[PDB]
Design an enzyme around this catalytic site. Structure first.
Site, mmCIF file in Angstrom:
data_model
loop_
_atom_site.group_PDB
_atom_site.id
_atom_site.type_symbol
_atom_site.label_atom_id
_atom_site.label_comp_id
_atom_site.label_asym_id
_atom_site.label_seq_id
_atom_site.Cartn_x
_atom_site.Cartn_y
_atom_site.Cartn_z
ATOM 1 N N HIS A 68 0.837 -1.228 0.000
ATOM 2 C CA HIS A 68 0.000 0.000 0.000
ATOM 3 C C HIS A 68 0.863 1.266 0.000
ATOM 4 O O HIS A 68 0.683 2.135 0.877
ATOM 5 C CB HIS A 68 -0.977 -0.024 1.159
ATOM 6 N N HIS A 72 1.684 1.544 -5.749
ATOM 7 C CA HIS A 72 0.277 1.088 -5.828
ATOM 8 C C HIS A 72 -0.615 2.251 -6.292
ATOM 9 O O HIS A 72 -1.453 2.042 -7.187
ATOM 10 C CB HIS A 72 -0.129 0.487 -4.494
ATOM 11 N N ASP A 107 -5.238 5.546 -1.199
ATOM 12 C CA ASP A 107 -4.620 4.809 -0.064
ATOM 13 C C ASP A 107 -3.650 5.714 0.715
ATOM 14 O O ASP A 107 -2.791 5.176 1.433
ATOM 15 C CB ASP A 107 -3.936 3.533 -0.551
ATOM 16 N N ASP A 217 -8.329 -0.881 -8.169
ATOM 17 C CA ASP A 217 -7.651 -1.278 -6.919
ATOM 18 C C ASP A 217 -7.131 -2.706 -7.006
ATOM 19 O O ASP A 217 -6.095 -2.984 -6.353
ATOM 20 C CB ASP A 217 -8.576 -1.183 -5.721
ATOM 21 N N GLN A 269 -5.884 -17.994 -3.327
ATOM 22 C CA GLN A 269 -5.933 -17.183 -4.570
ATOM 23 C C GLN A 269 -7.109 -17.634 -5.444
ATOM 24 O O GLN A 269 -7.788 -16.747 -5.981
ATOM 25 C CB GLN A 269 -4.615 -17.233 -5.333
HETATM 26 C C1 LIG Z 1 -5.592 -6.760 -2.439
HETATM 27 O O1 LIG Z 1 -6.487 -7.826 -2.822
HETATM 28 C C2 LIG Z 1 -5.820 -9.013 -3.098
HETATM 29 C C3 LIG Z 1 -5.149 -9.178 -4.323
HETATM 30 C C4 LIG Z 1 -5.118 -8.145 -5.369
HETATM 31 C C5 LIG Z 1 -4.483 -10.409 -4.498
HETATM 32 N N1 LIG Z 1 -4.467 -11.396 -3.561
HETATM 33 C C6 LIG Z 1 -5.145 -11.236 -2.366
HETATM 34 C C7 LIG Z 1 -5.107 -12.367 -1.353
HETATM 35 S S1 LIG Z 1 -6.512 -13.502 -1.586
HETATM 36 C C8 LIG Z 1 -6.491 -14.746 -0.425
HETATM 37 N N2 LIG Z 1 -7.678 -15.227 0.202
HETATM 38 C C9 LIG Z 1 -7.280 -16.242 1.076
HETATM 39 C C10 LIG Z 1 -7.995 -17.083 1.956
HETATM 40 C C11 LIG Z 1 -7.286 -18.005 2.688
HETATM 41 C C12 LIG Z 1 -5.835 -18.097 2.614
HETATM 42 N N3 LIG Z 1 -5.163 -19.049 3.373
HETATM 43 C C13 LIG Z 1 -3.849 -19.165 3.300
HETATM 44 C C14 LIG Z 1 -3.054 -18.348 2.436
HETATM 45 C C15 LIG Z 1 -3.691 -17.401 1.654
HETATM 46 C C16 LIG Z 1 -5.104 -17.265 1.726
HETATM 47 C C17 LIG Z 1 -5.837 -16.335 0.955
HETATM 48 N N4 LIG Z 1 -5.369 -15.401 0.017
HETATM 49 C C18 LIG Z 1 -5.850 -10.026 -2.103
HETATM 50 C C19 LIG Z 1 -6.586 -9.792 -0.844
HETATM 51 MG MG LIG Z 2 -7.199 0.908 0.418
HETATM 52 ZN ZN LIG Z 3 -5.557 0.380 -2.894
#
Ligand SMILES: COc1c(C)cnc(CSc2nc3ccc4ncccc4c3[nH]2)c1C
Ligand SMILES: [Mg+2]
Ligand SMILES: [Zn+2]
EC number: 3.1.4.17
Length: 313
Positions: A68, A72, A107, A217, A269
């Protein structure tokens, strides 16, 4: 007045594409942003002296957190630039001015922690702003920078055009609270399907702008696979630091923030692409057909994460 920004040929060409990466040279990012404003808005939209002083104050108020950060801000602004350029006639002069600035500022002064961590910590911002805590802070900081002497890039707008642009930026920044995305997209999905969606209806425009902000975003998932994969390291570096801080308050973090559960990243993911990313770019493509390349890039990256699980990488 007659002073354009020009980019090297490869940047001049690639910057128009949704999947453009702004590169590792921090000192070029301000010029890339000014370039995008000039082409998106006009060389007259802003006084260059004031814009340059706004850009550098915004940069100073982003912190040295893994994700962030200033990179970004400019990445999210570029995705908005690509959407606006491919949808020339659908947006007003004020909206094109407001949305690029909103993205750059969305942000501001992020500490690398979620609204949840602020509430469990009992951070003072959680007392000042009970919902969309950081997003209300981000808008607060945007207004503070606009009010510094010589930083009011909107000075040449009438009193009402000024109030309209600040209201666009505020809704735009609040909309980056992902907690608000799910409801906003369900509503947009219902309106598109029952034919009731109307872009002269201000409350409908707000919803569409909200979805563009979520799409910009999240645009990490719409890049070429190596950019996507390397940005996910930064995203998790922040999440796992937050999970560490949860443990320090005697709270088990959710698995997404627990560095002990790295192994489950590929599966997490998949959930994210299916639950958030694909639905986001699908609804946006239905509303703004020329944003399809984002949905196509997102689906390619879903397929790459499926190959990681199947051990092929
Ligand atoms: C900023 O938004 C995102 C972007 C762009 C890419 N990737 C993510 C992460 S998504 C994500 N959701 C989950 C749920 C359980 C998990 N358990 C173990 C390890 C990773 C996990 C995980 N990663 C976000 C939040
Ligand atoms: Mg934000
Ligand atoms: Zn952002």
């Amino acid at each position: 007045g007659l002073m354009q920004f020009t980019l090297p040929v490869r940047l001049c060409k690639e910057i128009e594409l949704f999947h453009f990466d702004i590169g590792p040279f921090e000192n070029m990012w301000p010029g890339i942003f000014v370039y995008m404003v000039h082409r998106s808005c006009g060389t007259s939209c802003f006084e260059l002296e004031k814009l340059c002083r706004f850009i550098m104050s915004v940069k100073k108020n982003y912190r040295r957190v893994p994700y962030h950060n200033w990179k970004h801000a400019v990445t999210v602004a570029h995705c908005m630039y690509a959407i606006l350029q491919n949808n020339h006639t659908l947006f007003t002069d004020l909206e094109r001015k407001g949305l690029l600035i909103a993205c750059l500022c969305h942000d501001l002064d992020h500490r690398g922690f979620s609204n949840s961590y602020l509430q469990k910590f009992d951070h003072p911002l959680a007392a000042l702003y009970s919902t969309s805590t950081m997003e209300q802070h981000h808008f607060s900081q945007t207004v503070s920078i606009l009010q510094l002497e010589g930083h009011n890039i909107f000075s040449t707008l009438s009193s009402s055009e000024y109030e309209q642009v600040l209201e666009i930026i505020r809704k735009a920044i609040i909309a980056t609270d992902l907690a608000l995305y799910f409801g906003n997209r369900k509503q947009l999905e219902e309106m598109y399907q029952t034919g009731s969606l109307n872009l002269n209806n201000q409350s409908h425009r707000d919803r569409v702008i909200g979805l563009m902000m979520t799409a910009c975003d999240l645009c990490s998932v719409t890049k070429l696979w190596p950019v996507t994969k390397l940005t996910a390291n930064d995203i998790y570096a922040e999440f796992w630091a937050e999970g560490d801080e949860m443990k320090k308050l005697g709270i088990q973090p959710i698995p997404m923030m627990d560095r002990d559960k790295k192994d489950e990243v590929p599966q997490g993911q998949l959930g994210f692409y299916n639950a958030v990313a694909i639905p986001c770019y699908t609804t946006l493509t239905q509303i703004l057909p020329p944003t399809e390349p984002l949905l196509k890039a997102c689906r390619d990256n879903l397929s790459q994460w499926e190959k990681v699980i199947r051990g092929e990488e």
